[PDB]
Amino acid sequence: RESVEQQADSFKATRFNLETEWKNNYPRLRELDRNELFEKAKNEILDEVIS
């Protein structure tokens, strides 16, 4: 119980730092996982094919 409280606060702070870095570097972008990036990449490829 004592350990998990400390870990939860540390994890929340760590996640906040990661989010702050994302905003500072990529404020106008959206975070996507590996699968979603693959879907976005293929759609762009199809657009270039049409263009």
Added chain:
Amino acid sequence: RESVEQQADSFKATRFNLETEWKNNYPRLRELDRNELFEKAKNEILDEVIS
């Protein structure tokens, strides 16, 4: 055997007519099924959220 040959030619001609209609109406677009349209629609929604 005789019937399937006639059907295959008719199906090919019918598909050609559908493709010709697609080009005449939507030359600069890509045909997608119901599922793919849902994926495209949600991505546009997320873009508007960011904008």
